[PDB]
């Protein structure tokens, strides 16, 4: 239905800019990176924290006695 | 017997050290170049705060370290407080008497 010329012409330019590349390998390093800081995280959690949650509860609940 | 000065203030130690513990965790946490900065910022809160509350038992050994060396307090500084007002009574109707 009677396009205008400027249909079917391209409207981008050049697809392969190694800036956006890059950016889809470092889609990989946070990745691997949030697959080693959650495991050192849940270390953390349980060391540090349930022990210090027993240690209070047994407080809490002779002073709660 | 420096107990006495630097526990009275207690409560600008404690904050003077949480603002140093949270910039401290900070300029650690921010030197690793690949996360958010709002999760630098949540570990290094989580990690200052601990430091902190850890630290505010401390100063509650330190809080009875230094009520055996002045026993009851709070109730003779009231006294002193006193004499100071009845001293100032009696030296200031004497003269009103003989003034």
Same mark, same amino acid.
């Given at each position: 239905?009677? =396009?205008?010329?400027?249909? =079917?012409?391209?409207?981008?330019?050049?697809?392969?800019?190694?800036?956006?590349?890059?950016? @889809?390998?470092? =889609?990989?390093?946070?990745? @691997?990176?949030?697959?080693?800081?959650?495991?050192? !995280?849940? @270390?953390?959690?349980? !060391?540090?924290? =349930?022990?210090?949650?027993?240690?209070?509860?047994?407080?809490?609940?002779?002073?709660?006695? | 017997?420096?107990? %006495?000065?630097?526990?009275?203030?207690?409560?600008?130690? /404690?904050?003077?050290?949480?603002?140093?513990? $949270?910039?401290?965790?900070?300029? /650690? &946490?921010?030197?690793?170049? /690949?996360?958010?900065?709002?999760?630098? /910022? &949540?570990?290094?809160?989580?990690?200052?705060?601990?430091?902190? &509350?850890?630290?505010? $038992?401390?100063? &509650?050994?330190?809080?009875?370290?230094?009520?055996? $060396?002045?026993?009851?307090?709070?109730?003779?500084? %009231?006294?002193?407080?006193? %004499?100071?007002?009845?001293?100032?009574?009696?030296? %200031?109707?004497? $003269?009103?008497?003989?003034?």
């Amino acid at each position: 239905s009677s =396009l205008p010329p400027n249909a =079917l012409k391209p409207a981008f330019g050049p697809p392969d800019k190694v800036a956006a590349q890059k950016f @889809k390998e470092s =889609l990989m390093a946070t990745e @691997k990176h949030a697959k080693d800081t959650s495991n050192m !995280w849940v @270390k953390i959690s349980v !060391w540090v924290a =349930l022990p210090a949650i027993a240690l209070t509860a047994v407080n809490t609940y002779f002073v709660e006695k | 017997k420096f107990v %006495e000065g630097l526990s009275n203030n207690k409560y600008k130690i /404690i904050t003077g050290a949480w603002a140093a513990s $949270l910039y401290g965790s900070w300029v /650690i &946490v921010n030197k690793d170049p /690949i996360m958010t900065k709002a999760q630098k /910022i &949540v570990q290094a809160r989580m990690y200052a705060q601990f430091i902190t &509350v850890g630290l505010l $038992l401390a100063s &509650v050994g330190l809080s009875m370290y230094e009520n055996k $060396l002045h026993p009851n307090k709070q109730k003779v500084n %009231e006294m002193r407080r006193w %004499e100071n007002a009845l001293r100032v009574a009696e030296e %200031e109707e004497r $003269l009103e008497k003989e003034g």
